[PDB]
């Protein structure tokens, strides 16, 4: 229950318990601060925050002091200046004279309150000098300066606490302590980046980013993550045409600070091997093109080829847009065809959870909701992998509550105990009508999270029907209020396709293809696309996909159009523009409006208010941005997707398989990247800077 | 000074097995039974203490087998042997002469017993001799300010010294049995005064069932 006290004059009202700098936050007054963080525990080692209080003779910790009925705080009076005065001066004493080569320079928390709260000049002048400190190695993403150190325990905190890593530590004592590896070891983790962040000094700093650019220099755009489907909010700093740096961005029901290391560094990807100019194939050679002659060339392979009904195949990858996928669609149908596919393994045919609800291929016990959480089970996913900052609100949910977890797929090294107890369907319903089932049963939010990997199988509808019958059999995984049936995609673009309807007939299912878009798609196998076929990659980089083409369309980057993004939970994000396509690359739906013109038919709608228009005509929730939607239609959803037409099928024995063998290097962006590259060279687990021999 | 950071060598890395003896493996668990079932880090300070005295000096090896042991992770047990200062995590000699020189051995004279031991051993602090013999560290207040000066060798004091007798001291730990603990040449025996006691005079004391109150 709240109270009431006392700030400067202003009376607030905050829980019991609650920190005093909680307090002065939400009344307004500004409090200094190094070590405190609101998303890490309570550290008080900077003594920065010391104010006043009258029933205290020495000056206290805001950071943590618990707040108290009726007490009165003062953050003005001359002790307290006196004392922001005196740590600042320690602060600096041994402080290296770095902030010209220092690329937190701008940004600085130290340099901003030593000019606030501190004095103008220093007195320590002694003969003997300042304090050094070795560099530490821990990894080809972090780069250390660590005579820059404050010893404020952020990244220690982060590593330990919110990622799992407890490598990093606090080694020595005194004026000698260091923090860093005790011998040479890398900081593995997915979440590495954030540390960077996290110290308000230049001691961790970012390594490709090393000494690019300085803040002032940058324009700032609040844009949406790609490479996950968690939909990440992030801002892009930009210095003109080249993207500098992606950096996290605030959103508590989403990411909550965080970003993980592919979302942060594959940024390196959108300079290099991207495609700027249209190619045509004339043999084993790509020849530079324009775009007449290129949509010229698409237009009379159409014409030559005669593609009857559902011979023209759409494939969409991860990383695109819903524009451009309802574009591509609408094209596709106006063309005759019914073959709208994803890039997944069993892309070809529908999904055996349906697209029916939405329900069916979304986490709809929210973001939100794993912070509610009692029982968990992980049906082949790996969240370190697969949304590595949902495994952090896993682990954080775990740390503090009762949360039980289990896991039916591959032993999962993961960032909390896992209780595994199967990698089969078998083993699934053994455990689902066994032990873990009535902990499932007796719990009042339990989670069932269903990875993609289950979607990419042949034998998908047998776990979906199981799952489906436990899910309405039981009533606490679906309730009026709570709904524990959750698929986690993996990539961007998955949920906005189902939502628009981009899955194909089984008239199409079976179909050998004469023309194959290919949208952004670079999972293709070579097997998927026949020898004789016409193909058309649209798309940014040239890693996969553009290798198959035919012909290649230059597209534009997440950094370089406004779209809309759907994650998992189905929120609708819209991106902004950073920066404009290099060179002759285009808008994507541009491009399709442009071809379909050049083909007999020709889209309805010619700028972007149209497209929101068509958007709100196929689905209305991917133009109410950041909502997230509750359903009306579980019972109904489960019932006649999930377990309806796939009692038919079979379950296999054979056991489930990682999905993503690499976290780095999972699209065309990351595996254009050299800095992903090197990240996978390291952090493999055969090297002996990732493994401590515990 | 303190060092904080670790570089492998042959004879220092990971690589290198360690294992508690099954002596040390009785009495370590004896250990773990001192503490809680779930809060068996505990026991991290005592059982690396029993590997640092296995094998003489707290390795890298041993960090990381207590780590196992409890299953704790490794970087918490270096935090640990990097605080702690008796943790030795450099290869020692023979006999560690640990010599204060806070102020009161200094009043008293700390300074002409280092000098005594650098001239006689030919070694600065921090410094291990050509024979493996004496590891020599000047150390702070170990706790017998009034019998001072005063030194440790590998845990046992010798106390209200003198150049000469520390001198010899080490010359006959270099060589044959070493003296027992203890004010040098038994000029006092503890506490006392060394004109002799002038408080505890009796040879049978006072027992307190005599004088308990009137309750009870
Ligand atoms: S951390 Fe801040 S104050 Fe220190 S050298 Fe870098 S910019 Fe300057
Ligand atoms: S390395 Fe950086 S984040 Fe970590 S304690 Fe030092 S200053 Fe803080
Ligand atoms: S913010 Fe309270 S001591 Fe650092
Ligand atoms: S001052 Fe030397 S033993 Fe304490």
């Known amino acids: 229950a709240e109270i009431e006290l006392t700030i400067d004059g202003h009376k607030v009202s905050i829980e019991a318990g609650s920190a005093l700098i909680q307090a002065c936050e939400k009344a307004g007054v500004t409090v200094p601060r190094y070590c405190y963080h609101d998303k890490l525990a309570i550290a008080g080692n900077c003594r920065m925050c010391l104010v006043d209080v009258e029933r205290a003779p020495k000056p206290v910790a805001s950071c943590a002091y618990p707040v108290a009925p009726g007490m009165v705080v003062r953050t003005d009076t001359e002790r307290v200046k006196q004392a922001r005065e005196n740590v600042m001066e320690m602060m600096l004493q041994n402080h290296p004279l770095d902030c010209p080569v220092c690329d937190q320079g701008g940004e600085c928390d130290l340099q901003d309150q030593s000019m606030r709260y501190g004095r103008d000049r220093g007195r320590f002048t002694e003969i003997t000098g300042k304090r050094s400190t070795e560099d530490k190695n821990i990894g080809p993403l972090v780069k250390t300066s660590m005579n820059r150190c404050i010893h404020c325990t952020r990244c220690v905190r982060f590593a330990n606490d919110i990622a799992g890593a407890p490598e990093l530590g606090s080694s020595g004592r005194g004026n000698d302590m260091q923090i860093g590896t005790y011998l040479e070891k890398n900081l593995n983790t997915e979440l590495s980046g954030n540390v960077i962040d996290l110290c308000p000094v230049g001691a961790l700093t970012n390594k490709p980013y090393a000494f690019r650019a300085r803040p002032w220099e940058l324009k700032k755009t609040e844009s949406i993550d790609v490479m996950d489907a968690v939909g990440s909010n992030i801002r892009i700093d930009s210095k003109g045409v080249e993207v500098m740096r992606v950096i996290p961005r605030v959103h508590e029901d989403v990411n909550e600070e965080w970003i993980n290391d592919k979302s942060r560094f594959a940024c390196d990807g959108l300079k290099t091997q991207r495609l700027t100019t249209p190619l045509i194939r004339v043999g084993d050679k790509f020849v530079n093109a324009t775009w007449d002659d290129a949509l010229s060339t698409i237009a009379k392979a159409y014409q030559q080829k005669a593609p009857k009904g559902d011979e023209f195949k759409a494939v969409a990858g991860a990383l695109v847009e819903v524009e451009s996928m309802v574009a591509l669609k609408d094209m596709t149908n106006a063309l005759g065809s019914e073959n709208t596919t994803t890039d997944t393994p069993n892309g070809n045919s529908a999904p055996a959870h349906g697209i029916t609800f939405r329900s069916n291929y979304l986490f709809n016990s929210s973001i939100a909701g794993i912070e509610d959480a009692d029982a968990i089970l992980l049906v082949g996913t790996n969240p370190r992998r697969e949304a590595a900052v949902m495994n952090a609100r896993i682990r954080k949910a775990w740390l503090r509550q009762e949360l039980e977890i289990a896991s039916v797929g591959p032993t999962l090294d993961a960032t909390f105990d896992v209780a595994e107890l199967g990698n089969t369907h078998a083993d699934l319903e053994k455990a689902l009508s066994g032990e873990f089932g009535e902990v499932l049963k007796n719990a009042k939010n339990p989670l069932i999270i269903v990875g993609s990997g289950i979607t990419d199988r042949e034998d998908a509808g047998a776990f979906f029907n199981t799952i489906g019958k436990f899910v309405e059999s039981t009533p606490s995984v679906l309730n009026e209020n709570w709904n524990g049936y959750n698929v986690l995609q993996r990539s961007a673009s998955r949920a906005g396709a189902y939502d628009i309807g981009f899955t194909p007939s089984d008239e199409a299912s079976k179909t050998t293809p004469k023309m194959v878009w290919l949208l952004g798609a670079d999972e293709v196998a070579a097997s998927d696309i026949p020898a004789d076929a016409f193909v058309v990659y649209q798309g940014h980089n040239g890693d996969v996909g553009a290798q198959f083409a035919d012909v290649v369309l230059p597209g534009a980057a997440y950094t370089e159009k406004a779209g809309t993004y759907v994650n998992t939970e189905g929120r609708s994000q819209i991106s902004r523009a950073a920066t404009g396509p290099p060179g002759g690359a285009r808008e994507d739906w541009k491009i399709l409006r442009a071809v379909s013109e050049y083909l007999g038919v020709a889209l309805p709608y010619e700028d972007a208010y149209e497209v929101r228009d068509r958007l709100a005509e196929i689905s209305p929730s991917l133009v109410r941005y950041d909502l997230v939607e509750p359903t009306v239609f579980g019972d109904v959803a489960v019932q006649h997707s999930l377990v309806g037409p796939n009692g038919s099928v079979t379950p296999s024995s054979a056991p489930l398989t990682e999905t993503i063998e690499n976290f780095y290097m999972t699209d065309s962006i990351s595996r254009s990247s050299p800095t992903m590259a090197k990240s996978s060279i390291a952090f493999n687990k055969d090297n002996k800077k990732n493994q401590a021999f515990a | ?216």
Not at chain 2, 23 to 32: L, S
Not at chain 2, 155 to 178: H, I, N, Q, S
């Open chain 2, 1 to 216: 000074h303190i060092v904080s950071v670790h570089r492998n060598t042959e004879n220092n890395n990971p690589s290198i097995p360690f294992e508690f003896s099954p002596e040390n493996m009785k009495r370590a668990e004896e250990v773990i039974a001192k503490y809680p079932p779930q809060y068996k880090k505990a026991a991290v300070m005592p059982l690396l203490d029993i590997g640092q005295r296995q094998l003489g000096y707290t390795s890298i090896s041993v960090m990381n087998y207590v780590a196992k042991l409890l299953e704790m992770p490794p970087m918490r047990v270096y935090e640990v042997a990097t605080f702690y200062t008796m943790y030795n995590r450099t290869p020692m000699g023979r006999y560690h002469l640990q010599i204060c020189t806070t102020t009161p051995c200094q009043l008293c004279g700390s300074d002409g017993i280092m000098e005594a031991v650098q001239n006689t051993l030919n070694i600065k602090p921090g410094e291990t001799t050509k024979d493996n013999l004496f590891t020599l560290s000047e150390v702070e207040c170990l706790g017998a300010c009034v019998n001072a000066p005063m030194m440790a060798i590998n845990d046992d004091y010798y106390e209200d010294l003198t150049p000469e007798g520390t001198v010899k001291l080490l010359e006959d730990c270099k060589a044959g049995k070493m003296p027992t603990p203890g004010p040098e040449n038994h000029v006092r025996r503890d506490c006392e005064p060394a004109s002799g006691q002038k408080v505890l005079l009796s040879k049978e004391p006072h027992n307190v069932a005599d004088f308990l109150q009137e309750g009870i």
